[PDB]
Amino acid sequence: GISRDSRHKRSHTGAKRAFYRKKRAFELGRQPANTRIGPKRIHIVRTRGGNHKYRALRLDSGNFAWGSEGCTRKTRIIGVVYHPSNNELVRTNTLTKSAVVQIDAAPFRQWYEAHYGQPLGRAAHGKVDPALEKQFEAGRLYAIISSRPGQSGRADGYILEGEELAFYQRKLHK
Amino acid sequence: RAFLKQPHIFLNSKVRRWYKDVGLGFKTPKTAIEGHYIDKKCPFTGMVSIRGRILTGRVVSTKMHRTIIIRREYLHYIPKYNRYEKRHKNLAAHVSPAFRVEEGDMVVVGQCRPLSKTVRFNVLRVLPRTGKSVKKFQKF
Amino acid sequence: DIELQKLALKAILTWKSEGIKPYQEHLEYLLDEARFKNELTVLFQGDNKILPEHRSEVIPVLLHLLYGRAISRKGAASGRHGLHATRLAIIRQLDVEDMGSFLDIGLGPLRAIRVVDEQGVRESVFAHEPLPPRKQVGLLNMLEAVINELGTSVEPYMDALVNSVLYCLVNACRKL
Amino acid sequence: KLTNPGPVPVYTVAGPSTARPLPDWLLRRRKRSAKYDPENLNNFELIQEFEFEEASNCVRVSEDGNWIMSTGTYKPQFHVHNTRELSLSFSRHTNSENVTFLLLSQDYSKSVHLQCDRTLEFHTPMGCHYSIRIPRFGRDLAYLRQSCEVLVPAVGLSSDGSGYGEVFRLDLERGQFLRPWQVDVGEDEPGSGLQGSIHAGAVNVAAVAENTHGLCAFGTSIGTVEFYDPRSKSRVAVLGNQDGEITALDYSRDGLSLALGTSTGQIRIFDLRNPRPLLKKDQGMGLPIKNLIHLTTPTEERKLLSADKRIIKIWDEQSGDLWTSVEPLVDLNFVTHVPDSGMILTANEGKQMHCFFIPNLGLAPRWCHFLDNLVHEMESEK
Amino acid sequence: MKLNISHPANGSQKLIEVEDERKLRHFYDKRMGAEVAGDPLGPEWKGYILRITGGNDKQGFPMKQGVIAPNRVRLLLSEGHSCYRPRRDGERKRKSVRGCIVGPDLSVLALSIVKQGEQDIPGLTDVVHPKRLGPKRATKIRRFFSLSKDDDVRKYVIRREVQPKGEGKKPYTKAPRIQRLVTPQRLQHKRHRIALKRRQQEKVKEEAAEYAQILAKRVAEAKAQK
Amino acid sequence: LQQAILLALGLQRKDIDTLATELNLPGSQVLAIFMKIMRKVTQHFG
Amino acid sequence: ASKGRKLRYTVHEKLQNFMAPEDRRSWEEHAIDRLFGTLFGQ
RNA sequence: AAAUUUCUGCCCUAUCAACUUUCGACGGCUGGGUAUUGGCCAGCCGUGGUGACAACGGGUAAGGGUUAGGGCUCGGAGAAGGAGCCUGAGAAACGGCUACUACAUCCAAGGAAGGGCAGGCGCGCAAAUUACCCAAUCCCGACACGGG
RNA sequence: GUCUAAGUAUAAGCAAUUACAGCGAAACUGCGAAUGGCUCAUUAAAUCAGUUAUCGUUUAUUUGAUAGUACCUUACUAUGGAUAACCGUGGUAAUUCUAGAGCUAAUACAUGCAAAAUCCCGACUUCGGAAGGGAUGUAUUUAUUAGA
């Protein structure tokens, strides 16, 4: 019964219409994924052209990018922090696209002290912004999910840095 | 809310503003060039592609969230009268904050993909004229 | 050999110890070829991280199996994404005392090697080989991964590191 | 079929053997391509298709006890079984992952469920009686049988009128939303959306009895139980300031002693007129207890305690002693018991729904008589 | 309930008429695949023990393993199950089936002796029955005969002699066309595959080099116009 | 409930039908329970 | 105004005669109305 | 192949001037799914949108290209009834399964399978083959053959 | 329903002068059935038509091309299992009902180690052909850079 059609809606003139045609297979709406915290629970489904997409529903580790310095690592997921759409998603701790989520700091700190070597979160090219260093001494940074976990099966994204970092931290304070 | 951002231009780097032309002999306004508004539905700012149909016309409604309405009049030929009959239409287009918006002006709009139920279109040029309210009438 | 390693682990669990007991499922999921990386990130940065009490009881078996899994060539792909990123992530997620015991198990004959004496050059040592060049290039890949994923913290093992790598270099320049 | 403890042995006849199972496609691939020797005797099923391929939400057995309706997650649906015939009667699907259901009739012929997309959907064996979209988001559900009216707690604050927090209610012989039962949750951010805010603004649990008086007990996220009375349409009590979000709410068989619990994992048994606790237990870790109901061996009374850390502890009430505790090896979303005796059913985050048998508490139920002989076979094994 | 007992190690099977449900009483309350001694059956059955593998009750409903019921139970069956061949593919048909528990209500019991006693059953233990086909793959035949790397499985085959029509002609031998045999033609096909591989790659090398010198010439002419 | 069943036959001395009625049971379940009883008294004896 | 967020008190036609009220209650109502009288407040 | 999408063109009627917002009515921001764009759906707020150039409502009476001409060409819902599921590149096949309902078959009574058009009568009196082949043209398959 | 030199033949199938050879029932595999048409409440620019657009999408089949990806501490070494058909023991009153027992194949499902290899560079150069310098695919997702 779920779909994407327009036959149930009204026109630009505000007028409705029957235009009753039976719901067809290219109009298909599929049930959403509440990608939450758990071990890997990903299903695979063939689609138009038999093309398989990965519906993740429980996920534990995502790959996130410290790309202002040049690495990305597969770290664990703590839990959602904020969703711009819905506090209910924030309540039930769901992983969607563009979702700011706290993650671990151990392999990132390992890479920092492996390349630069300066201990972090405990010359001049090794430089961490102070709020990011607060996240580092907390051991749990703020990244964001920029992948579709329901439509790619995976939680990939980038760490939160600088302007968007202060923006979303202020929104946490809101 | 969330943070407005150009989706694939790296900002948080320690060591740009992407704006594209639409071509077709159009000029990206300076407000679209460097004006710090960011909207995914503007042609120069967002990643939408203008193609196909080019049109123009007169606004009747500027008072909406980045959405104007163009009243399209034409002289339909009724054969029973052997005459040309005035028929007004109503159009839809997304307003970029790049242009200065006037009411009753002649606004040039080009076709992009459908951005809502109604909007399939984007402003590319505005001609500031002294057009009056809906009492006025002209083939355009 | 993965089958050898699996029967080995079965006899390891035949040794019934309370240190190895709460992680045995993680050992089995490490040895299962379809859940290697994800079982590794279940082990580390998970809820069931290693308790430091029986950590001494659990380290040797897991380091030995992890060495064997870094060595095994069957399931690895081509390029760097074949087995190089595996060793990369292994040494990225291992501990420095675990790195000392890891280099201890990694260096078979060159664990106790001396390249410099009271004299300058130990030619009596340098005019001998304990190893084939296949295991030598593997050794150098291992220690390169060690140094790159460690960084500064390579100080307390230097007296083995420099001896091993400098013996390999001097054997190389002798053979050229 | 195994057994977790020594003295009082529980018996997981069925469930996920592995907390992280492989993909089932690769599993059957390795099965059909590999030689394997499994324990064919002791490994078996009771009932056909006792799984949901991702997880499940809520199960209930009927008042007739012949139906097993379980709501499951991947391609969200609900499996209904005739437990007399040990198979799926059918499996009907829905539009989103269900929150929680309730059976109206003594058989499965009438079901209703609160569904995550702000909906209350109804179900006959013919099909679906049309869902009602509630105004605001909700947590749980209760049913006035003596005057058929569904009531549901709601999260957030009300839009107009007061700023309490509400319990939506709709009568079955009327058809309308009668009135949201205003239950005070507290304050919220004035600059926000209409769905409330994340920090607070939730009514969580609601409990009632349907043989005794059945006072409308409500539980809200500031850790507060309120009371309404049927035929009064009004609040009766405000009580129970606690630290955690109150998750448990269940009347006893007498209809007087209440056993609530807070999301710190702290369970409290109260008398309705004694404000002092009849009993208190702070156990496990801080990971929240979810489900707590009373249960009786044919002589004594005891209590469930289900905390989501794979912790299911049966405590005593008359002595307070922890009678037994089980680790079901997975996270679990629902627990029931058979009201006959014996079996403890648990919908999990895992693949297969997992269930348990206890012999010291009760017997194998009326539809699985030979389970006593199965635990006897285990007794011959050890 | 009559008893079809098989000695599968002997390859033999035998249905036997069995009365005296008193003597059958110990078979009750037994799941399939479980071990029960035939010693309380009869005096020729001393030392004998067997597992139970299936059976059909009155009205011939077969008995699935792993189902806790004593009575007849209405199940649903998918493709890869026994007791049910699917009418079409991807098909889950719902069918009634007798449960594991050996009740009083059977007609036959499928059993298999897994260990003999000292007595020999005159028709079950006594007669040997070979596998109708031996293996076809060369590694399988090499494993059975424990052959070496040189021993010519081609002559170490198993042959079958048959007498055809034509008024009693000579016997005729049959040999199962070994699948996993490396033939020089197959080796040649591998050579041909890798030859086409290297030929493709050198052709890409040639066209890349000639395109490189061509584009060098073209940009030389372009900047010469410039 | 084993102790009650053991009382009801071993010293109260009645039959399986009145046992089925009294402690509320359909059939041979109490017979299987005494099979368990025999199992435990045999694992004690010897 | 919006999708469902307002309680449109509309009589629902199939949702009209679902279940008859079944008074399953064990006491005599005088116990409980005295009980609600002398709850915590009294 | 399939799938959206743009401008134009409907027939009549004001005893049809207000309508839409009554499953959002229009935006714009964010998420979900879809092969993708899309209030298509879920959170956020803004205000609409159409109409006396004829909205909206009513009525049912459901054409286009090939141009001396006529010719010739093209042109929604269901498979006993609702509900759910299953293959495939493409179906929500009506091909299947499951429940409910309703018939209704055999039976040794414990069980088990299943639901079409065509024809003749339709007063007791009446009127067109129960023909044959895939021979040609065309269509489908491991495929020169097989089936239509 | 579906067979070609070019899938799997031990039919204890026919026909003959040495794993196999021809014909070849059966069975597995792959293809098929998005139609041929039958019924009946209609569809009043929503279909439909012209006219665009996909820089917003999926595509078995067609033919065209199409893959540089070694080594990487085992020091050692052209691979697996099922099962069908088949042989037998039955059950029931029984339908595409099928139980037990014993076989065997894949273009069915499954894994898959020679000091070289291959690129880009090349100093010197007799067109010599080369010292020796660097480096090791693809599919998925995210971030960055280039895109002159």
Automatic annotation (TrEMBL), chain A:
The keyword Ribosomal protein applies. GO terms for molecular function: structural constituent of ribosome. InterPro entries: Ribosomal_eS8, Ribosomal_protein_eS8_euk, Ribosomal_Se8/biogenesis_NSA2. Keywords: Ribonucleoprotein, Ribosomal protein. It holds the Pfam family Ribosomal_S8e. GO terms for cellular component: ribonucleoprotein complex; ribosome. GO terms for biological process: translation. Belongs to the eukaryotic ribosomal protein eS8 family. This is 40S ribosomal protein S8. It comes from Chaetomium thermophilum (strain DSM 1495 / CBS 144.50 / IMI 039719) (Thermochaetoides thermophila).
UniProtKB/TrEMBL annotation, chain C:
It comes from the Eukaryota. This is Uncharacterized protein.
Automatic annotation (TrEMBL), chain E:
SMART domains: Ribosomal_S6e. Belongs to the eukaryotic ribosomal protein eS6 family. Residues 197-226 form a coiled coil. Keywords: Coiled coil, Ribonucleoprotein, Ribosomal protein. InterPro entries: Ribosomal_eS6, Ribosomal_eS6-like, Ribosomal_eS6_CS. It comes from the Eukaryota. The keyword Coiled coil applies. It holds the Pfam family Ribosomal_S6e. GO terms for molecular function: structural constituent of ribosome. The lineage of its organism: Eukaryota, Fungi, Dikarya, Ascomycota, Pezizomycotina. GO terms for biological process: translation. This is 40S ribosomal protein S6. GO terms for cellular component: ribonucleoprotein complex; ribosome.
From TrEMBL, chain G:
Coiled coil: none annotated. Belongs to the AATF family. This is Protein BFR2. It comes from Chaetomium thermophilum (strain DSM 1495 / CBS 144.50 / IMI 039719) (Thermochaetoides thermophila).
